[PDB]
Write an enzyme that holds these catalytic residues in place. Structure first.
Site, PDB file in Angstrom:
ATOM      1  N   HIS A  32       0.102  14.060   4.976  1.00  0.00           N
ATOM      2  CA  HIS A  32       0.917  13.695   3.820  1.00  0.00           C
ATOM      3  C   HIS A  32       0.386  12.384   3.221  1.00  0.00           C
ATOM      4  CE1 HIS A  32       4.591  11.518   2.247  1.00  0.00           C
ATOM      5  NE2 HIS A  32       4.580  12.605   1.496  1.00  0.00           N
ATOM      6  N   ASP A  33       0.320  12.306   1.891  1.00  0.00           N
ATOM      7  CA  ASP A  33      -0.202  11.113   1.221  1.00  0.00           C
ATOM      8  C   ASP A  33      -1.453  10.637   1.951  1.00  0.00           C
ATOM      9  OD1 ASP A  33       1.049  10.173  -1.128  1.00  0.00           O
ATOM     10  OD2 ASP A  33       2.864   9.690   0.014  1.00  0.00           O
ATOM     11  N   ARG A  69      -2.826  12.450  -4.273  1.00  0.00           N
ATOM     12  CA  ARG A  69      -2.022  12.021  -5.413  1.00  0.00           C
ATOM     13  C   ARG A  69      -2.892  11.161  -6.324  1.00  0.00           C
ATOM     14  NH1 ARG A  69       3.092  12.083  -3.527  1.00  0.00           N
ATOM     15  NH2 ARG A  69       3.388  13.726  -1.948  1.00  0.00           N
ATOM     16  N   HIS A  82       0.047   5.718  -5.187  1.00  0.00           N
ATOM     17  CA  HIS A  82       1.321   5.927  -4.522  1.00  0.00           C
ATOM     18  C   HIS A  82       2.230   5.277  -5.548  1.00  0.00           C
ATOM     19  CE1 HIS A  82       4.727   6.224  -2.039  1.00  0.00           C
ATOM     20  NE2 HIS A  82       4.902   4.917  -1.962  1.00  0.00           N
ATOM     21  N   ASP A 274       2.669  12.868   8.757  1.00  0.00           N
ATOM     22  CA  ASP A 274       2.299  11.490   8.489  1.00  0.00           C
ATOM     23  C   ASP A 274       1.610  11.016   9.752  1.00  0.00           C
ATOM     24  OD1 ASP A 274       3.222  10.963   5.931  1.00  0.00           O
ATOM     25  OD2 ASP A 274       5.201  10.315   6.613  1.00  0.00           O
TER      26      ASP A 274
END
Ligand SMILES: O[C@H]1[C@H](O)[C@@H](O)[C@H](O)[C@@H](O)[C@H]1O
Ligand SMILES: [Zn+2]
Ligand SMILES: [Zn+2]
Ligand SMILES: [Zn+2]
Ligand SMILES: [Zn+2]
Length: 296
Positions: A32-33, A69, A82, A274
């Site tokens: 994630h991210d 992102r 972010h 994460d």
């Protein structure tokens, strides 16, 4: 020549899985991210850091799905963000790392989720979608076919998972309505049913139960080849040390990893977590990968 132990080579675990298996069927670890690993300022970290290591470390540890992102710049490039914060990482940076990983491990494939994270900078000659397609997607590294994508067709390539609108080029998984902070079901490439658990801002207990509920469904619908399950174990920051993505991951990752270990299911879905690392045991991404044993 394929044996179940070949799933233990975290850099080439997809090798023993048959070419005809849809990526949707495979249980794949994701991050994630993914590009937040360069954040240094404690204030920025507690709020938006979700990974400690770079893309290659993530890949060498089994992750094959990446949550990218980006933001369109005045330079007609896309950089990772972010919210309003630049992550000091670029889209080209990720693709180059993916290219290297795929060259070194041609049996694997990389699934790249791309989402517009922040308003375009003024001065761009085009849009987020038109710039990504013209300056990035044209690259042969990106799979250009769709449908219920099979592993064989994806090996050595990056498979796009669109989370942005305006696409004008074929390839990967089409963009679809993604409700906010919910567990939902919908459809993608005409023949793929998709179920996503993305409750990124619910209380801790609600989150753990949500992950388990969607995983329970996945484990009991293991023969549904055209169904895609994406389960985010990540949880948004509360802004403090006792409720940051790190603190949440420290307990959720081992908890869910233990669920898989105990149950020993034949499928658990695409588990996006994460902080992939080796600090907590059992290791979630490893157990997720080991859940593909019945496919060999
Ligand atoms: O902060 C959240 C979180 O990153 C979710 O996983 C993503 O799906 C949402 O779009 C985002 O707003
Ligand atoms: Zn890098
Ligand atoms: Zn510039
Ligand atoms: Zn289904
Ligand atoms: Zn390691």
């Amino acid at each position: 020549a394929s044996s179940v132990n070949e799933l233990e080579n975290w850099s080439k675990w997809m090798q023993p899985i048959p070419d005809n298996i849809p990526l949707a069927r495979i249980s794949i670890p994701g991050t994630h991210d993914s590009g937040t690993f360069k954040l240094q300022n404690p204030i920025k970290q507690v709020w938006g850091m979700t990974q400690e290591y770079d893309f290659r470390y993530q890949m060498d540890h089994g992750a094959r799905i990446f949550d990218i992102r980006g933001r369109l710049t005045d330079d007609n490039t896309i950089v990772l963000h972010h919210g309003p914060l630049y992550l000091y990482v670029t889209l080209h940076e990720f693709i180059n790392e993916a290219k290297q990983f795929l060259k070194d491990n041609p049996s694997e494939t990389i699934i790249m989720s791309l989402k517009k994270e922040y308003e375009d900078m003024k001065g761009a000659e085009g849009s987020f979608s038109s710039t990504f397609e013209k300056n990035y997607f044209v690259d042969p590294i990106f799979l250009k076919t769709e449908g219920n994508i099979k592993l064989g067709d994806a090996r050595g390539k990056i498979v796009l998972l669109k989370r942005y609108s305006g696409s004008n080029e074929s390839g990967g998984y089409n963009n679809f309505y993604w409700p906010d902070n919910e567990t939902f079901t919908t459809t993608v490439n005409q023949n793929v049913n998709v179920t996503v658990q993305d409750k990124y801002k619910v209380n801790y207990d609600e989150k753990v139960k949500s992950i388990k509920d969607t995983m329970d469904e996945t484990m009991n619908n293991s023969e549904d080849l055209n169904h895609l399950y994406i389960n985010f174990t990540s949880l948004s920051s509360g802004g403090t040390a006792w409720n940051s993505p790190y603190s949440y991951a420290s307990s959720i990752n081992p908890e869910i990893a233990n669920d898989i270990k105990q149950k020993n299911p034949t499928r658990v879905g695409w588990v996006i977590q994460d902080y992939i690392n080796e600090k907590w045991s059992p290791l979630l991404y490893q157990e997720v990968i080991r859940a593909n044993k019945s496919l060999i």
